[PDB]
Enzyme design. Structure first.
Site, PDB file in Angstrom:
ATOM      1  N   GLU A  69       3.802   5.788  11.731  1.00 11.72           N
ATOM      2  CA  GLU A  69       4.300   4.590  10.829  1.00 11.72           C
ATOM      3  C   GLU A  69       5.392   4.214  11.789  1.00 11.72           C
ATOM      4  O   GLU A  69       5.851   4.821  12.806  1.00 11.72           O
ATOM      5  N   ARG A  70       6.001   3.026  11.100  1.00 11.38           N
ATOM      6  CA  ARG A  70       6.957   2.433  11.797  1.00 11.38           C
ATOM      7  C   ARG A  70       8.164   3.344  11.412  1.00 11.38           C
ATOM      8  O   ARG A  70       8.180   3.491  10.335  1.00 11.38           O
TER       9      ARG A  70
ATOM     10  N   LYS B 179       0.658  -1.257  -0.035  1.00 10.58           N
ATOM     11  CA  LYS B 179      -0.096  -0.012   0.100  1.00 10.58           C
ATOM     12  C   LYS B 179       0.791   1.140   0.129  1.00 10.58           C
ATOM     13  O   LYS B 179       0.886   1.899  -0.859  1.00 10.58           O
TER      14      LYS B 179
END
Lengths: 467, 167, 58, 487, 66, 466
Positions: free
Chosen positions: A180-181, A154
């Site tokens: 987010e990571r 994605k």
């Protein structure tokens, strides 16, 4: 004013402000902070006590501890100096490339620009991604939701879009990797560096990176969204630019909100979502705009919780969206990449005028056939799969081709795929389908159509396949 | 809203919203101690079934209460604002609670009246002083060996870890 | 097959010391815990060290 | 002493509302009179809500609560290897103490972007399927998701055992220090587990952090974080550690409870919200550093046990949203026997290739693809019964491949072997034979190669890849082996 | 083994007195002897009831295939 | 010292103890109560008020009433002389064979034996029930948790096993009727008497009864399990013994916990749950074991709340299981008693390991076939198997036959069944499946396999059919 930590109940820091208070939303700095603890004022609980929100971790803190109000809400570095910079919420050089020699600060409460400011017309932004434009014709400045649930390349796709687009325009960027990571932001990082679109030798890119990963105070993470907005608005109008605003992930924002909501005393309504869900979005989305003096073409990555959009949150989200990309995990499971949901991935702003009728119709016919095809599914699962009636077969196959043709290689996940990504500007596409629509390639069969850019490549692929 | 004398701790809630009230009220004009005693007096003047008759049944209607706990507290003279605040707690339900309210204000093994630190024994410093680490040395001269089951018995206590080193 | 019986003999003597350790201890400690208390002067040492806190902390 | 001591305001539930302690450090781990430790979560204006690490039949009110003056750190070292510890870093292996006399803060937050370097190493498990199809790298994070004792654990174990050869390597690229977080897992289970490792003695490079079933809730809670700090240690020492969080699911439960006991509201799925933050932050600490940090890694195998495959199980949903992919285990194949029981159609390593060896890539790309159709050919023109040879082959082959990946409970392996055998089927060489003989063959083939083509094995391992020559070496070898299998 | 001198002097002194006796290291105590004998049984079960004072020995065999 | 009833709201007795204020779990005996009205302290609520849980029932308690702390947990009579005896929770014989002359008492908190102390080498406890051993093999010392619907012969089964097993046994057994139908206990009583395993000129029955039936007031039911643990530890650790511990029903433990939770002013977790279900569980579970010092072979009745397993409670429980017995109502509906579903009923200790691969494999084929079948029935549900492959038809039928073959008469419940019990040693078990699997059998009727004993009996039956 001065406050005392009167209660730290988790990272909800209730500060009793002593010398009065500061107004709502005031960013407060805790005295005795090695990494200034911005507190966001949330309620004046009364008693010159506010409920505040920690925007740092609350460890080690002495209760009572002295807080000095920053006298404003969160004010953040702003200036051109943010281009090719990773800023955190508080702007901080989390590029780790020294302080941003920003030339302006801004309170991150940016608000809704006026009705009148809004460019009433936009022009379809063409992505050159066939499907994309085709079904959801995007408008420059548009609010794009990329609904899509997790993982499905994605992010990859998104990035790729960035490749395709941000490069391609004098349009600037804000990328907010929120929640987010840290890892993915790292990965991502390297890509820009690599791309040279983060070019650092001239620090500038055209891009602000704003990161508020999943290890930060939710409120803060929640607020990193505002931060970016505030900045971008500056670039939008003031720098006049069409900024492209990547938000990953606005769901998580919402979420961040919800997690706190409870703690904020708000009863976080159904599905757990904050009761303020509406305001949170409303204000936010309404803060977002493409005005007349610029565009924030707003690309909002939207995780679809559980692929439930009927999940109130996405459901809300939808309202704000004007172009929706709903990526279909089922389709993804059908392996594709284009993995999208197509018969859901729209822009209400598709037009027989504006996209011209050709496009429009083609899409509508197509959409229709897919919808029809879907109907046929009903026969086939239990009643035949190279088998029943045939005219329908003709369509089935056609749909199927269309599907395959709809599939297009990934352009960086060539690393994975070995498929060189492709892209097809609009006419060849429209046409493309028209040919297929024209049922030309019927002598020709399916798999030749898979994962292509323009149709020739499929024709070519057929040939390779005839062996 | 007014900024107030809030000589800290001071348990801010808890019958101490009022204490803290008078930690600004009383201290305004510093009629504190005078009133502390008003309260004390009152303490048993109340808490007998007599003032606290309306405790006994509040069915008696709050009006009546502010007219029987006194017309104020009125029958006496504990009233600087004492009575008005009485006539408030009464109604405000904080009347059955009052000893503690008084405590909170007052009572100051430590709170603006004295001190109390300990590691070992009742080591109720008691003194509003700036220090006490001498005023303990002091105390350890009413004795210095004696019993010390008159509070800390450091005997089991420290005798705890060692039993751990073995296991 | 050799090792385990050797190790058993050691392991038992080890286990047999600890138990004797707790039981030994328990009698020694449960006897003399009582007697100590006559020393007023450990509360002598409490105050003394307590001054080297009360003074010597701040 | 004074002030930063408290009298237990109230106690019940190991939740000490504590009178006093007021100038306390947030999240200070405190100390009980009992000598139990507690953690100061809530500084409320008029108490300190302290979670008592231990339990409160053992205590009562007014009791002196003394600050420890420390926000949690846990002993750290690496003398944890060969050790089963509790969260506080204390033997529970009961092997005297641990040699890890450094302590290091648990609450230390995750690094930045910059101290990382993303993956490009593979990480190997010996599990063919794993290593192939959801090929994993190091510093990573990946969900083991599945239901109960599917050898639930086994998966980790065999992997760990598998790392033994790497730990028998002298690398630190594959020499992998293993960290096992046991959450909620009764001692017995754990015992078995320990024992398993012991038996395997992979334990020597291994911490087993064990918060069994027992443990007062924070204890299970804490353990991961603990493990985490401990793992960050290696990571910053360039060392590559693998931590298995098994499982936060139980933790969350506890935590919710903890919250609830904190009189905080049941959030979504009755679980409070920042249990997301909880784990999220926890999990952000797993990483592959860049070189400045010795390049080290903490590879994370969190485990989540779904209940009824529920992933919309909020926390799973979360975790998924964290995960860099998940290793989905399915029952059916399991029931079918088939272990792998995985649905790779539901297992992912998004990553794929950074996490690989070219060797593996060479067969696996194709295979994955092939399986994809193969699996697919169960659905189009089949829901269960039909015929045609072209495709039948694909099935046959497929079936074979199934076996070929079918790797029963207990199986640490080395990748080239895996590739070796895989190669045979991929390159279509046994299609013929029945599944039943595959395994047998495989084995047989293995001693054969092991012995003989140890040469070859040497090479393939060496090349990280199979050279065309090595391939050829295979071609005859396999053919011949098959032939030998007869001939 | 040793820390706090103020207790420790006496406490450690009593422990050594133990060692300085040979009616047991000052005594033993039934309770221990009972458990010892029990625990001694169990660990023999732990590793089989052979006696590893001696080692194993094996036997040998062959057959003809064709 | 003494405490005052300051509040009674049900069996949560809010006691203000001032005079002392012992720790939590100190048992208090209420003054002004002829009954040994135990409240066991639950919380020190503060104000030297404790929340206690009356284990017991209440009433007739004028508030303020004096309660004198008995100062310790439930101390309960212990010694071998408990065998035979049915004692209530508070350890008094409710066998009423006069009192018991204990040896000692015990606080009914007993703890987790040590990790280091365990001997943990699971060995099948065989059962002779094909279905069981094969599919849900039991391990000696194992904790088997019997999920099962109400009345499904769940109880029957356990009993049935008890006969089969507990007889053979050399260690003792404990029967804990926790929250059980007194009636069922009556019944139980009489078999036990009858059986003479409870031989009553024997307080040296192979089985000790502890009953804290359905009727008890909650606290009593809540805590009685802990008690039981304490006893068995006595026998194991102290008396060596491999205990078989019958619990009917741990669910009621759970129930009790949750029930109180509210009253424990808690935020009671989902469905009202006790969140301390978890802690409870751990704290119990760990007491449960099979030490170095023996076995508590633990037969844990687990009512499956609403037969939802999904239900957190069982969900948790699983972790603690080692052998899971799922009696499956669906199956039960198929009439079958045996009613198990072993794709559910699984045993950690079911392993190619622990119980042979033969078992496993023969099973894996079965598990498989069934698993597949399970897949099929639904398509078939529509389609029948009619236009669906014959091999499948065969196999399905076989799977089913195997199913049928698992149906096994109850010797105990010959009254109930009509059918006369069967018990089948392993070999014939193996054989059976292997044969059916061989399709050797298959030329045969499905129902032939029904309610058989060994395969012969199916054969016998085949003749008898055709």
């Amino acid at each position: 004013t001065t406050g005392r930590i009167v209660a730290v109940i988790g990272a909800v820091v209730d500060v009793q402000f002593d010398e009065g208070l500061p107004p709502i939303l005031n960013a407060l700095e805790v005295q005795g902070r090695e990494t200034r603890l911005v507190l966001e004022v949330a309620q004046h609980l009364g008693e010159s006590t506010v409920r505040t929100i920690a925007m740092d971790g609350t460890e080690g803190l002495v209760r009572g501890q002295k807080v000095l109000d920053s006298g404003a809400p969160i004010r953040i570095p702003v200036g051109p100096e943010t281009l090719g910079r990773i800023m955190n919420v508080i702007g901080e050089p989390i590029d780790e490339r020294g302080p941003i020699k920003t030339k302006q600060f801004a309170a991150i409460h940016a608000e809704a620009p006026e009705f009148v400011e809004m460019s009433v017309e936009q022009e379809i932004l063409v992505t050159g991604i066939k499907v994309v434009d085709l079904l959801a014709p995007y408008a420059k400045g548009g609010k794009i939701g990329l609904f899509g649930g997790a993982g499905v390349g994605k992010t990859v796709l998104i990035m790729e879009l960035i490749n395709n687009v941000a490069k391609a325009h004098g349009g600037y960027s804000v990328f907010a990797g929120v929640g987010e990571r840290t890892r993915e932001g790292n990965d991502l990082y390297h890509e820009m560096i690599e791309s040279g679109v983060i070019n650092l030798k001239d620090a500038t890119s055209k891009v602000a990176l704003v990161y508020g990963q999943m290890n930060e105070p939710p409120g803060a993470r929640a607020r990193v969204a505002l931060t970016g907005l505030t900045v971008a608005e500056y670039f939008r109008d003031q720098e006049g630019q069409d900024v492209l605003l990547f938000i990953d992930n606005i769901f998580r924002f919402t979420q961040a909100g919800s997690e706190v909501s409870a703690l904020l005393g708000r009863i976080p309504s159904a599905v757990g979502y904050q009761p303020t869900l509406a305001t949170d979005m409303g204000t936010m989305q309404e803060r977002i705009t493409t005005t007349k003096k610029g565009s924030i073409t707003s690309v909002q990555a939207i995780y679809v919780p559980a692929d439930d959009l009927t999940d109130p949150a996405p459901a809300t989200t939808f309202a704000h969206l004007d172009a929706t990309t709903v990526l279909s995990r089922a389709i993804a499971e059908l392996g594709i990449y284009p993995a999208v949901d197509p018969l859901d991935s729209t822009s209400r702003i598709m037009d027989p005028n504006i996209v011209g009728s050709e496009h429009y119709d083609v899409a509508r016919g197509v959409q229709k056939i897919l919808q029809d095809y879907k109907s046929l599914q009903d026969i086939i699962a239990i009643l035949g799969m190279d088998e029943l009636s045939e005219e329908d077969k003709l369509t089935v196959s056609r749909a199927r081709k269309i599907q395959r043709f709809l599939s297009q290689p990934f352009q960086v996940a060539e690393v994975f795929t070995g498929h060189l990504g492709k892209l097809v500007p609009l006419k060849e596409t429209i046409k493309g389908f028209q040919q297929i629509l024209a049922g030309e390639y019927d002598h020709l069969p399916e798999q030749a159509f898979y994962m292509v850019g323009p149709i020739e490549e499929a024709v070519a692929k057929a040939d390779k396949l005839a062996e | 809203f007014a900024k107030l004398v809030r000589p800290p701790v001071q348990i801010y809630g808890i019958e101490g919203r009022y204490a803290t009230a008078l930690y600004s009220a009383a201290s305004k004009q510093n009629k504190l101690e005078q009133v502390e005693k008003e309260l004390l007096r009152v303490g048993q003047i109340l808490k007998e079934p007599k003032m606290a008759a309306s405790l006994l049944n509040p069915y008696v209607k709050r009006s009546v209460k502010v007219k029987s706990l006194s017309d104020m507290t009125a029958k006496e003279k504990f009233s600087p604002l004492t009575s008005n605040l009485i006539n408030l707690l009464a109604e405000n339900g904080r009347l059955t609670n009052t000893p503690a309210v008084i405590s909170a204000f007052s009572t100051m093994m430590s709170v603006h009246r004295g001190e109390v630190p300990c590691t070992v024994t009742t080591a109720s410093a008691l003194d509003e002083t700036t220090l006490t680490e001498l005023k303990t040395v002091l105390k350890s001269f009413l004795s210095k060996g004696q019993v010390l089951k008159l509070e800390v018995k450091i005997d089991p206590s420290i005798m705890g870890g060692m039993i751990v080193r073995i296991g | 097959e050799v090792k385990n019986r050797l190790d058993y003999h050691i392991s038992v003597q080890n286990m047999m010391r600890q138990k004797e350790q707790e039981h030994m201890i328990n009698w020694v400690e449960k006897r003399v815990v009582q007697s100590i208390s006559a020393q007023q002067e450990k509360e002598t040492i409490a105050k003394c060290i307590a001054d080297l806190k009360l003074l010597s902390k701040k | 002493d004074l002030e930063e001591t408290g009298r237990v305001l109230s106690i019940g539930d190991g939740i000490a509302r504590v009178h006093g302690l007021r100038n306390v450090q947030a999240e200070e781990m405190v100390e009980f009179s009992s000598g139990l430790k507690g953690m100061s979560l809530n500084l409320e204006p008029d108490n300190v809500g302290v979670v008592v690490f231990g339990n409160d039949k053992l205590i009562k009110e007014g009791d002196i609560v003394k600050r420890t003056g420390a926000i949690v750190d846990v002993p750290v070292g690496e003398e944890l290897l060969g050790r089963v510890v509790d969260a506080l870093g204390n033997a529970i292996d009961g092997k005297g103490p641990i040699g890890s006399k450094a302590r290091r803060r648990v609450g230390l937050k995750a690094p930045g972007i910059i101290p990382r370097i993303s993956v490009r190493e593979p990480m190997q498990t010996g599990i063919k399927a794993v290593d192939s199809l959801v090929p994993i790298g190091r510093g990573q994070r990946e969900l083991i998701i599945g239901d109960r004792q599917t050898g639930k654990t086994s998966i980790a174990i065999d992997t760990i055992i598998n790392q033994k050869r790497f730990n028998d390597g002298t690398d630190e690229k594959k020499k992998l220090y293993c960290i096992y977080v046991a959450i909620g897992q009764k001692r017995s289970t754990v015992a078995q587990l320990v024992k398993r490792l012991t038996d395997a003695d992979a334990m020597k490079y291994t911490i087993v952090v064990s918060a069994t079933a027992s443990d007062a809730a924070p204890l299970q809670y804490l353990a991961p974080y603990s493990g985490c700090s401990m793992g960050e240690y290696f990571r910053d020492n360039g060392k590559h550690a693998l931590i298995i969080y098994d499982d936060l699911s139980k933790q969350a439960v506890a935590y919710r409870q903890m919250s609830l006991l904190l009189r905080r509201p049941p959030g979504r799925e009755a679980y409070p919200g920042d249990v997301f933050y909880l784990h999220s932050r926890l999990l952000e600490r797993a990483a592959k550093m860049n070189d400045a940090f010795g390049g080290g890694s903490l590879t994370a195998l969190p485990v989540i046990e779904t209940q009824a495959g529920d992933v919309s199980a909020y926390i799973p949903t979360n975790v998924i949203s964290i995960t860099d992919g998940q290793i989905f285990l399915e029952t059916e194949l399991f029931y079918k026997g088939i272990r792998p029981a995985i649905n790779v159609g539901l297992s992912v390593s998004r990553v794929g290739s950074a996490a690989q060896t070219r060797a593996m890539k060479q067969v696996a790309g194709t295979m994955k693809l092939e399986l994809a159709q193969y699996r697919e050919v169960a659905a189009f023109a089949q829901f269960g019964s039909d015929l045609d040879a072209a495709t039948q082959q694909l099935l046959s082959r497929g079936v074979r491949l199934t076996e070929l990946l079918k790797q029963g409970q207990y199986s640490p392996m080395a990748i080239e072997e895996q590739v070796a055998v895989i190669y045979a089927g991929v390159r279509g060489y046994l299609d013929k034979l029945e599944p039943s003989k595959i395994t047998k063959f495989e084995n047989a083939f293995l001693s054969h190669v092991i012995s003989q083509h140890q040469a070859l094995l040497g090479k393939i391992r060496t090349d990280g890849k199979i050279s065309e020559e090595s391939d050829a070496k295979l071609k005859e070898i396999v053919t011949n082996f098959l032939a030998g299998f007869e001939a | 083994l040793d820390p706090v001198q103020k207790l420790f002097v006496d406490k450690i002194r009593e422990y050594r007195t133990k060692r300085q006796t040979s009616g047991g290291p000052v005594d033993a105590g039934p309770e221990y002897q009972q458990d010892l004998d029990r625990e001694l049984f169990k660990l023999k079960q732990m590793y089989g009831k052979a006696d590893m004072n001696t080692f194993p020995n094996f036997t040998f065999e062959d057959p003809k295939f064709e």
